Structure 1
């Protein structure tokens, strides 16, 4: 029996990690080569610290993995996760995710199946999509909304304004906003959208952890009459116990989790039914392997899935999410931001929504790869992401 297994083993021959910045964001791809000549591609994108992820892959995951059998995705995932002893966290998990996704790509290519078919097939025809409408005026928002409705979108995440104020003398360098102004403007945004559009479309909004708990609860009560499809990240991950007070008195639909990279962040959240949609970034939790398990975990508790799909993610990562989304029965919706020309050249054949739906790739594997030569035209470039130094008017840091 060991001959047969070995007759079919698939030895890893190389591991590489490429950072590319075709457009606005540093994107990170892991490429796994095997003795069988089948090559896999994975997303490892942690856009704020890409060199750290590349160091992790090149200096540590590569010598660990060369020579091991790519077939055994589950063992290699369990092994990689604990390999540095200390574990979890964004740098390690993204590096592992790149490998994990590439291993799944390889297995699906070898099975001659689209990735979602390897999982067990479709439980939906396609996944609904929401887009981002952001403007500093209501009329700018209306213009973007009108355009999206025309394209067939039924769900749109709307944000008014961008985030004067009474600071102290000589305020510390940072990115300032005012929580009360943000709340006022957002409630007014919803009120205006409902007045103009009624129930034409589902309105989403991302609070992006900008509030204190007392403000979050007030906001939930102020916004609930407008029936948002979901309110995202109404609290930071360290304060989700405060969601119980919201759940006890508001019917507002809640989404949370794009920041998660440790299972302790989500277990009590889900067990206690504190959110309606889990928003994890697949590469932050360690790839396809844990995403499947988390999807199953959520299903048991009646929690639905809306994986984080920001511009700072490869089209490979986006394709993987669509595979997960057409497969997992509790997947709800896929976030999408239009790809630009440079990105499309580096990652050919990336799907775009058609009439409000994203369709899974139907060729073998993930269905999207990286053009290595094209990636070279757009190397990594340092960006400070100053918005993460978010400060309140008194000069103190708030979670960004």
Structure 2
């Protein structure tokens, strides 16, 4: 191995389907190119600015071989640090550098880490509908394709909650009722168990919709239905309330997709407040920190379920699968099918086979962006009105 000098950096936003995806490209003097995911779907232009104006200058001419030093240097380079815009930008680079290292080694990414500790990683997918019948229909399809874990969400029929007790002139927003949500959800679990027994594992994402006292009552009522895990039962700033849950309930808990400051998870994990960490790899700054985080969780008996939503590149997904077959405490990989356009833009993206995702076996991450195709699907501004989540009295709730 000789020094590997960074010659250029790029950032490309593309929307082949429903979401703005962000890819970072790292070129080297030697012609070895790396690709990484920097997807913060809500603020893509900020991430691109961060990469283009601030990360490029400090990277050009640097030795890409030393991923650790570059990561430590990048993370503190603005003095102020730890946020979704900065971390995603850094993640894109970090992943590209790891991709370059794997390509230089002639190895699949996970082989650099120490190779596999499992054969493939189990997968769950999303069945979301506004009627139970709509969920049943989705579940049947997934069961036939070989899935044994399914994330199930029952929304309000026609988007609107029933007889919302709201005010005379409600402030504009995306309204919902916490109590009806909890009942719909418990009805959902009850119905699924009556209809499917233990045919598959059921996951549900509370998505930080509840107040702490509501969270604790929900945990106890849902326990009988034995969810594979209940996700984000509280927002990141109220996780101390988990202690009251852990003392009186056996419910399995997942949390963390929102995290982008280590202080959000450190106490959480050291006190065993959750069973599955859910961090979005690019939100925490890339592969480098994800490895360390995996290892910390291992010490405290916490398993891993990285956030793998549709708002993420297949490059990001492939990286997570590499991480998932290597880290001994990885549990399951979230997955939503990519459309034709997405496959065109990121060729060779793996899809689950009989409920399993298999790591890429060529050199590198195994997935890149086809920039000619991406040019055909440029960024498009999206409001994400769902983030303006309001309760019936008009108040914002964490979305």
Q: What's the TM-score, normalizing by structure 1?
A: 0.98
> Counterpart in 2 of 1:52?
46
CA RMSD of aligned residues (A): 0.6
Q: Counterparts in 2 of 1:21-32, with a 5 A limit?
A: 21-32=15-26
Aligned to 2:398: 399
Which residue of 90, 97, 111 maps to 1:117? 111
Instruction: Name the counterpart of 2:133.
Output: 139
In structure 2, the gaps of 5 or more residues are: none
Deviation at 1:169, TM superposition (A): 1.0
Consecutive aligned runs of 4 or more in structure 1 exceeding 2 Å deviation: none
Residue 14 of structure 1: aligned partner: 8
Corresponding residue number in structure 2 for 1:292: 291
Unaligned runs of 5+ in 1: 1-6
Distance 1:170 1:161 in 2: 24
Indicate which of 10, 29, 32 corresponds to 1:35.
Answer: 29
Q: For residues 276-304 of structure 1, give each alpha carbon's deviation from its aligned partner in whole angstroms, at most 9, with x where no partner exists.
A: 00000000000000000000000000000
Alignment partner, residue 345 of structure 2: 346
Corresponding residue SS for 2:126? strand
Question: 1:318: Cα distance to partner?
Answer: 0.2
Name the stretch that deviates more: 129-138 or 157-166.
Answer: 157-166
| Cα offsets for 1:26-83 (capped at 9, x unmatched) | 0000000001110000000000000000000000000010000000000000000000
Partner of 2:80: 86
Aligned to 2:61: 67
Give the distance between the partners of 1:231 and 1:356, measured in 2 at CA. Answer: 20
- 1:334-380 CA distances to partner (integer Å, 9 max, x unpaired)? 00000001110000000000000000000000000000111100111
Q: CA deviation at 1:182?
A: 0.2
C-alpha distance in structure 2 between counterparts of 1:394 and 1:124, whole Å: 50
Separation in structure 1 between the aligned mates of residue 164 and residue 321 of structure 2, nearest angstrom: 42
Equivalent runs, 1:1-400 vs 2, <5 Å: 8-162=2-156, 164-400=163-399
- 1:394 Cα deviation from its structure 2 partner: 0.1
1:194-217 Cα offsets, whole Å, 9 max, x none, are 000111110000000000000000
> 1:239 offset after TM fit, Å?
0.1
Tell me the secondary structure at the aligned position of residue 192 of structure 2: helix
* Residue 104 of structure 1: how far off its partner (Å): 0.1
TM-superposed deviation, 1:161 = 1.6
Deviation at 1:397, TM superposition (A): 0.1
Aligned residues: 394
Q: Which moved more, 1:204-213 or 1:155-164?
A: 155-164
Task: Output the TM-score relative to the length of structure 2.
Answer: 0.98
